[PDB]
Every structure is written in C-alpha cells, then in structure tokens.
Design a protein around this ligand. Structure first.
Ligand SMILES: CCCCCCCCCCCCCCCCCC(=O)O[C@H](COC(=O)CCCCCCCCCCCCCCC)COP(=O)(O)OCC[N+](C)(C)C
Ligand SMILES: *[C@@H]1O[C@H](CO)[C@@H](O[C@@H]2O[C@H](CO)[C@@H](O)[C@H](O)[C@H]2NC(C)=O)[C@H](O)[C@H]1NC(C)=O
Ligand SMILES: *[C@@H]1O[C@H](CO)[C@@H](O[C@@H]2O[C@H](CO)[C@@H](O)[C@H](O)[C@H]2NC(C)=O)[C@H](O)[C@H]1NC(C)=O
Ligand SMILES: *[C@@H]1O[C@H](CO)[C@@H](O[C@@H]2O[C@H](CO)[C@@H](O)[C@H](O)[C@H]2NC(C)=O)[C@H](O)[C@H]1NC(C)=O
Ligand SMILES: *[C@@H]1O[C@H](CO)[C@@H](O)[C@H](O)[C@H]1NC(C)=O
Length: 642
C-alpha cells in the first residue's frame, strides 16, 4: 500500500492501545544509533575544555573576591575550587565513558548529573546549545546504543549485534523536528518580516558572490531573513520523505557549514551535522562495513509525554509572569536564536544612606562578571539583594538602592525600562504574578521611524540625531560639553520644559519649536504633560566635525593656490593607517600561519586545563604544599609551550 510505503505505518494500529504498543516496539538495526553515539561522544570530548570553562575555571570561582551569583534557586551555593575541579573531572570521565561505549548506564549518569548542575548553577551563560546538549543527554541516557562497535562487545559477548526498539529513533527524530519547527514558527516575528534584525550581516565577505547577482538591499532582505525561514522549514520537512532526502541533506549541511563559518557559536553546528544523517534508513552504516509487556507500554508513555512536554515548553511563557520582561520571559529555552540585539548606553546606580541620609553613586559594573543583568527583573532583584547584604563591608549603613538603566531594542527610541524612584531592596517580586515596576514599551512610534527615515534624509551626513522618549513625571539631566558646538533640540510630541541651572532659567516648549542649548553647562528636560513625550537631539561635535571643517578649509586653500615633543594626532592617524594596512595584510596572509597560531592557542588552552586539573587533584589527594612551590607551579602552568 502507498500509505504504508510513504508514511511507514497504517491507521489500524492507531485504533487500539494494544495495537499502538505492539506497533511502537518493532526491532531495528542499531548501527546509526551507535554512529551517532560515537560522534556525540567525540564532539562532547572536544567541546568540554573550550566553551564550558575548564580552562577559565580558576578566575570564575576564585576564593576571597566575592561575586554576586545568579542561580535559579537561592539555596544553591557553589563548591570550592578543588571540588569544582573534581566535578569537572568526573564529568570528563563520564564523557569519555560515553564516547568509548563502555559501562553505558553509569557513564550516562556521570555525564547527566554535573552538566545539569552547572547549567542550573548559572543563568548568565544560558544558550540554545547547552539546553540541546542537556536534552540529548537525557534522551540518550534511557536508550541502548552499546550493541555495535564498542568495547562493551569485546568485554561482553551478550551485548553485541542485538536489536533496538523503534522509539529510540522516534524520540531523537521528533526532537530534531521539534527544534527545527519551533525555530521556524518562532522566526515569524513582526521585526523579522521587516528585515530590521541582523540587517548588518550582509556586509560579511562570505556573502561575496551573492553581491555579484543581487543588490545589497536585495541580499540583505530576501536571502538572510526569508531564506533562513525557508531553510528552517525545509530542514524540518524534507528529511522525513524518502523522495527529498539527498537534496534536504545537502541543504542542511550547507546551512550548518555556513552558520559555523559565519558566527562564533562554537560546536553547536557540528553536533547538528552529526544529528543530521539519522533520518535515513537504519542500515546505512552497515553497507560501509561490507502479548507485549509493561516496558513496551513504558517506552510509549514516556515517548508521548516527552513529545507533549517538549511541544508545550517553548510556548509556556504565559505562566512565567515573574520572569516576564519587555520581550518575553528568560532567554535560551525558546529556540529563538538571533532575533534581537541590544545596544546599552548608560547605567547609573545611586544609593541613599539609612542613617546619615547622604546620597552617593556606585560603579557601573562593580562586583559582577556578566553583562546580561540589564534586561531581566529577577537578576536585578538578586543583584539588589547581594548589594544589600554586601554594602556594610565598606562602612555603609542599611542602604536604599536606586537604579537608572537606559536601553534600546532593534534601533528604537531610548527610553527607561524601570521607574527610577522605586527601591528594589524592599520591593516585591513573585514568579506567578505580573511585576508592577516595569515600564511598558512605546510601540506607537513604530511608523514614525519611517518619518525618522525622512529625518535621516535631512541635513548634513556628519550631523547626529538621537531620538529620545521620556515618561511623564521623570526628568533627564545631561551635561553638554564645551566642545559641543551647534547643539539644538527640536520637540516632536508632548509638552516639555527645558531648564538651565547656570542662570536658573526654565522655559516651556511647544510642538515644532526649536531651541539652542548652551555648551559647557548642565541642562535638564522635564515632562510636564499627562502624556509621554517624544523629542530629538540634533547635534554635531566630534572629530568628524573638526576634520570636516579642516577639510573644507584645506579644500578652499587647495582650489585657491595649492595641492591637497611628539604629535599625538599624526601618530593616531598613522596608527589608523597601519591598522588598515594590517587588515589588508591579514587578507593577503595565507591561512597556514593563522591556522598554526589557532592550533597553538588551542594547545595552550588544553595544556593549561590539564595542568590545572592535575594540580587540583594533587592538592585534593596529597594535601596542600608550601606556597613557594605552588607559585612556581602556577608560573610554570601559565607559561606558553612554544
Ligand atoms: C485514545 C488516544 C489515542 C492516541 C492519541 C495520540 C495519537 C498520536 C498520533 C501521532 C504520533 C504518531 C507517531 C508515529 C511514529 C512512527 O510511525 O514512527 C516512525 C516514523 O518516524 C517518527 O517517529 C515520526 C516523527 C514525526 C513525523 C511527523 C510527520 C507528520 C505527518 C503529517 C501528515 C502528512 C516509523 O517510521 P521510520 O522512520 O522508522 O520508517 C518509516 C519512514 N520512511 C519509510 C520514510 C523511512
Ligand atoms: C545649529 O543648530 C542646528 C544643528 O544643531 C542647525 O540648525 C539648522 O539651521 C539650518 C540653517 O541655518 C537649517 O537648514 C536646518 O533645517 C536647521 N536644523 C533643523 C531645523 O533641523 C544649524 O547647524 C545651527 N543653527 C543655525 C541657525 O545655524
Ligand atoms: C522651573 O520650573 C520647574 C517646574 O516646576 C521647576 O522644577 C521643579 O523643581 C522643584 C525644585 O527645583 C521641585 O520641588 C519640583 O518638584 C519640580 N517639579 C516637578 C514637576 O518635578 C524648576 O525648579 C524651575 N526652575 C527655576 C530656576 O525656577
Ligand atoms: C565631541 O567632540 C570631541 C572632540 O574633541 C570628541 O573627542 C575626542 O574624543 C576621543 C574619544 O572619543 C578622544 O580619543 C580624543 O582624544 C578626543 N579629542 C581631543 C580631546 O582633542 C568626542 O568624542 C565628541 N563626543 C562626545 C560625546 O564628547
Ligand atoms: C571605615 O571604612 C574603612 C574603609 O572602608 C575601614 O577602615 C573601616 O571599615 C572603617 N573604619 C573605622 C575606623 O570605622
């Protein structure tokens, strides 16, 4: 029958529970599962000492210097350095055991435990590939892949050349299809259909022949955005059918190779390439060489429940209102890669003393190791709690901490994200309720960006225009510098007051009015309307302005008569010229020198990781020697091999 030829199954097995159970447990050849197991083990062995932090473990959890952690659960506290090195050693031993296929269950447990522990230990390092690695580890733990091409066959003849059930293939195929389909359906965004996101990626040299047949706007619009969506849909769909197998495999391989070359994601693309050929016939590596029980019901119930859970999970942001933010939820467990970009401008942290009442300012990125806390509420709350418990170390009383964070998403209006008058230390945050101290985004200016495009077709190219939207009640204080000549402010919408404190003069502005700000003084803008206000700064100050004035003077002198202690400006210009010549030389440099330097750096990373692991194991087993020998070993370990 054509139905069973194409779909691989019949309808009459779906009529009964027992018929479905008997259908889902047909035996098959284990060769491709063993090939995928070997490839996944080798890729994880190569991937552990590079991205997970085995080399950089000594400066992430160094003793003495306290860093505000960001765990999912507040009870989690990391172990000291020797125990963390022991945990990474146990994880590497489990990865080696999964790679060689000996003692498969214990190896899968010893790989599944510390990877999930490290993934739950840190929220700032969440990504798509770590979550995919955790899901693939949890999937491959339960399956049996030790029946072909393994040391377990040599150590035991009972587990060599044996059959495997169908659901071990079905779960992995469903997982890959779920990842592809969820990425494709999450790429249907309002900012992605207009091509604003990742619009600067078309300037890369790997798109060099694509500019030969298409214009730059056409290459940036049709190929990057729509072509990626079509490639995701085709990678989801074409691998199921036997007619579209080879062309779909070629497209998947080309897409994964291009994404591996274009970005710095790591070894995610190689793992996707290793999981790509699983959709073929289950005897494809073999040609290269030459009443049901209760567990049958368990292997189907687990498959159905896991598929339902993984289908429901990426659209489960409607229950996580506590972690909800401007866009949606947390990041990483939604498969929406490369959709949004950030450009942070300024962060100001103020503190008021609880006893003296004095006001002071803190450093922007003090006591923190990451830059991902400026977009999420829970990380801000944990940072406030950490600063509240840390600030008495510097002769400070019980503090009041006020934040002021400005951010822009996908080149929009720079507006505040939180209210700067709410103390976060005494504030309330719950995972099951909507937060009350998050400013909503102003999407009403979205067509007026095109009007801003008209402003982008306005005046000199060297001029600068900044779009600022302000909430009612707040005030923006700025210091226009002395060099900022010809600085003007134009009001677009609302009612604002501009105040100069040097002469104590405040004026009200109307729509369309223009004002000239003083240079070298502090100024403030207040919103004095019930509605939020939108306005624009038009100014040009910089070395571009100075060089344009000097270029006009030199051009006038040239057309009149002529041709066209150290010197820091001349040396800076020569350094920029030498930077351009070094870029041109790197383009002209053959690949072998860069490859040798890359291999030397990777060998240094691997050697430093192995030496630090050996030093930590010697300190754990044989105790801690005197500090002179330890300092000598630290100096010897950090030395480049050469
Ligand atoms: C009362 C409750 C009753 C039950 C309620 C729930 C019913 C759920 C039904 C939907 C789930 C069905 C799973 C079927 C899995 C299955 O058949 O396993 C596999 C099929 O592969 C899978 O696991 C399927 C992965 C998802 C594919 C989704 C395709 C959707 C098609 C929709 C219509 C077009 C057996 O085939 P095979 O790959 O081993 O070899 C045959 C294929 N060729 C010939 C191409 C190589
Ligand atoms: C300083 O203010 C702004 C730049 O900050 C400029 O003002 C423009 O004035 C010129 C004519 O002088 C007009 O063509 C432009 O349309 C004005 N800018 C607007 C309305 O966007 C100019 O560089 C300086 N102002 C003056 C009066 O010279
Ligand atoms: C110009 O008018 C504004 C508008 O009232 C004044 O701004 C206020 O400043 C005072 C203290 O300077 C505060 O007590 C008020 O709460 C502010 N108003 C708002 C709505 O926040 C500004 O001080 C005036 N400047 C001069 C020089 O008179
Ligand atoms: C405003 O104009 C000044 C012109 O001096 C710009 O500054 C120079 O700034 C760069 C850093 O961006 C320094 O490396 C140079 O040494 C400065 N030149 C000097 C001091 O002669 C400045 O970037 C412009 N923009 C702002 C926001 O101030
Ligand atoms: C005041 O602060 C300094 C540095 O923070 C330190 O000596 C100590 O915490 C305080 N000293 C006294 C005498 O209270």
């Amino acid at each position: 029958s054509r139905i069973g030829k194409l779909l691989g199954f019949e309808w009459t097995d779906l009529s009964s529970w027992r018929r479905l159970v008997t259908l889902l447990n047909r035996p098959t050849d284990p060769a491709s599962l063993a090939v995928f197991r070997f490839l996944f083990g080798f890729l994880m062995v190569l991937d552990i000492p590079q991205e997970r932090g085995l080399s950089s473990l000594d400066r992430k959890y160094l003793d003495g210097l306290d860093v505000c952690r960001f765990p999912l659960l507040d009870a989690l506290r990391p172990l000291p350095l020797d125990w963390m090195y022991l945990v990474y050693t146990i994880m590497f031993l489990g990865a080696l055991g999964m790679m060689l296929g000996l003692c498969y269950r214990i190896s899968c447990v010893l790989f599944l435990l510390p990877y999930w522990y490290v993934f739950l230990l840190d929220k700032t390092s969440w990504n798509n590939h770590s979550y995919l690695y955790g899901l693939l580890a949890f999937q491959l733990t339960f399956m049996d892949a030790n029946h072909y091409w393994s040391v377990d066959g040599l150590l035991n003849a009972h587990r060599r050349n044996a059959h495997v059930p169908l659901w071990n293939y079905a779960v992995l195929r469903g997982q890959i299809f779920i990842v592809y389909f969820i990425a494709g359906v999450k790429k249907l965004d309002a900012d992605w259909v207009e091509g604003y996101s990742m619009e600067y990626l078309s300037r890369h040299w790997l798109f060099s022949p694509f500019k030969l047949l298409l214009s730059e706007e056409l290459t940036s619009l049709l190929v990057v955005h729509w072509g990626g969506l079509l490639l995701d849909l085709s990678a989801g769909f074409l691998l199921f059918f036997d007619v579209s197998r080879s062309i779909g495999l070629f497209f998947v391989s080309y897409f994964h190779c291009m994404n591996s070359q274009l970005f710095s994601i790591g070894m995610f693309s190689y793992v996707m390439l290793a999981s790509s050929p699983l959709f073929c016939s289950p005897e494809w590596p073999r040609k290269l060489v030459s009443k049901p029980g209760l567990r049958h019901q368990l292997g189907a119930a687990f498959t159905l429940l896991y598929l339902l859970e993984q289908l429901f999970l990426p659209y489960s942001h409607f229950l996580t209102q506590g972690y909800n933010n401007w866009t949606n939820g947390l990041y990483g467990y939604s498969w929406d890669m490369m959709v949004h970009s950030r450009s942070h401008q300024h962060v100001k942290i103020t503190y008021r003393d609880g006893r003296t009442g004095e006001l002071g300012y803190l450093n922007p990125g003090v006591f923190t190791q990451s830059r991902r806390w400026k977009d999420h509420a829970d990380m801000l709350k944990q940072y406030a709690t950490c600063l509240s418990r840390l600030l008495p170390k510097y002769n400070v009383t019980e503090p009041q901490i006020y934040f002021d964070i400005w951010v822009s998403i996908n080149d929009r209006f720079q507006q505040r994200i939180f209210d700067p008058r709410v103390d976060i230390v005494q504030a309330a945050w719950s995972p099951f309720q909507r937060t009350s101290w998050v400013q909503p985004l102003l999407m009403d200016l979205s067509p007026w960006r095109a009007k801003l495009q008209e402003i982008k077709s306005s005046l000199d190219n060297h001029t600068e225009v900044v779009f600022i939207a302000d909430f009612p009640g707040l005030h923006l204080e700025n210091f226009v510098s002395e060099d900022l000549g010809n600085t003007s402010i134009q009001l677009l919408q609302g009612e604002v007051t501009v105040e100069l404190v040097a002469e104590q003069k405040n004026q009200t502005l109307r729509e369309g009015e223009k004002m000239q700000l003083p240079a070298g003084e502090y100024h403030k803008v207040y919103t004095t309307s019930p509605s939020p206000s939108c306005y624009m700064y038009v100014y040009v100050n910089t070395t571009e302005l100075a060089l344009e004035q000097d270029l006009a003077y030199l051009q006038e002198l040239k057309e009149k008569v002529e041709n066209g202690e150290p010197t820091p400006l001349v040396q800076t210009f020569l350094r920029r010229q030498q930077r351009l010549q070094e870029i041109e030389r790197r383009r002209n440099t053959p690949f072998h020198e860069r490859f040798f330097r890359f291999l030397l750096r990777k060998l240094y990373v691997f050697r430093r990781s192995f030496l630090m692991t050996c030093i930590s194991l010697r300190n754990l087993i044989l105790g801690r020697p005197s500090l002179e020998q330890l300092a000598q070993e630290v100096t010897y370990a950090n030395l480049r091999p050469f």
